[PDB]
Amino acid sequence: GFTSKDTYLSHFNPRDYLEKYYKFSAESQILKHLLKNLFKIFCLDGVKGDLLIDIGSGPTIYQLLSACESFKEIVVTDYSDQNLQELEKWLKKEPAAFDWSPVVTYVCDLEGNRVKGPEKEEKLRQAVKQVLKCDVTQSQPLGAVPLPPADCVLSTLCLDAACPDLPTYCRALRNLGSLLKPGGFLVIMDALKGGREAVEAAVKEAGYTIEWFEVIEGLFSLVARKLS
Numbered sequence: 001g002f003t004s005k006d007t008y009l010s011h012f013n014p015r016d017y018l019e020k021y022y023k024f025s026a027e028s029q030i031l032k033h034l035l036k037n038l039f040k041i042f043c044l045d046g047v048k049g050d051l052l053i054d055i056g057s058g059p060t061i062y063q064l065l066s067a068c069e070s071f072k073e074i075v076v077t078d079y080s081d082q083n084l085q086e087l088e089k090w091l092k093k094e095p096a097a098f099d100w101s102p103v104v105t106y107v108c109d110l111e112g113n114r115v116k117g118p119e120k121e122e123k124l125r126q127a128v129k130q131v132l133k134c135d136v137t138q139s140q141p142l143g144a145v146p147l148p149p150a151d152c153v154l155s156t157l158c159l160d161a162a163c164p165d166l167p168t169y170c171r172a173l174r175n176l177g178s179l180l181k182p183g184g185f186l187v188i189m190d191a192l193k194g195g196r197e198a199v200e201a202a203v204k205e206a207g208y209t210i211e212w213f214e215v216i217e218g219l220f221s222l223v224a225r226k227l228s
């Protein structure tokens with residue numbers, strides 16, 4: 001049930017999935033829980049800095065909506081071109097882009113209705129600085145792009161999309177660490193697909209210290225810091 005780089009394919013039609021799962025019953029419920037958790041990480045728990053890199057963004061922006069409260073600069077990334085195109089239609093405010101309005105409104109509600117949808121959308125659009133290819137199996141997952149050491153790497157539902165075996169996952173997390181300052185944050189929100197202990201081993205062996213781990217089969221979230 002594992003995927004390797006030689007077997008990986010992402011959904012060819014990312015738009016149909018946005019329409020199905022990101023329009024918000026079971027899926028709406030799960031998305032709400034994710035969004036509440038991301039609110040806590042990025043607006044309460046001290047995960048903040050200048051530069052966040054979202055690894056394996058997929059075609060979605062919901063995982064960045066609270067994060068742009070806490071990071072001036074966000075880089076979104078994906079191995080597959082069709083996911084990057086779906087992101088760019090939205091960032092560039094094209095008429096053909098997915099309508100993230102309902103989710104955006106819901107996040108504005110979680111944040112106390114300090115702003116309305118358009119203002120929140122604009123804050124995210126201003127924060128997203130680059131849209132790039134990544135390959136987590138590479139020592140330099142973003143290739144030659146000369147980003148400075150970042151404050152946070154976020155990975156959401158990546159195991160959920162395709163699960164590598166444990167040493168491959170540990171190596172990916174260690175490759176992602178090359179993107180982080182010492183002490184930089186690693187935030188993972190994903191599917192348990194050896195369970196919690198396997199995730200914890202991969203995180204620790206990839207050179208991070210877990211601050212906390214929460215169950216939110218099943219979904220978890222965790223925040224770790226790269227060894228300092």
Ligand SMILES: Cc1ccc2c(c1)cc([C@H]1C[C@H](n3ccnc3CN)CN1C(=O)c1cnc3[nH]ccc3c1)n2Cc1ccc(Cl)cc1
Pocket residue numbers: 003004005008010055056057058059077078079080134135136137155156157158159161162163164168169172173176
């Ligand atoms: C630390 C981490 C671990 C696993 C990850 C990710 C991060 C990110 C993803 C994948 C899945 C993710 N996705 C696609 C649709 N929705 C989501 C989640 N938002 C996008 N996306 C990638 O952009 C990606 C990155 N680099 C790669 N190199 C070879 C394939 C490949 C895919 N994997 C799935 C995956 C499975 C097996 C293998 Cl060997 C490698 C990756």
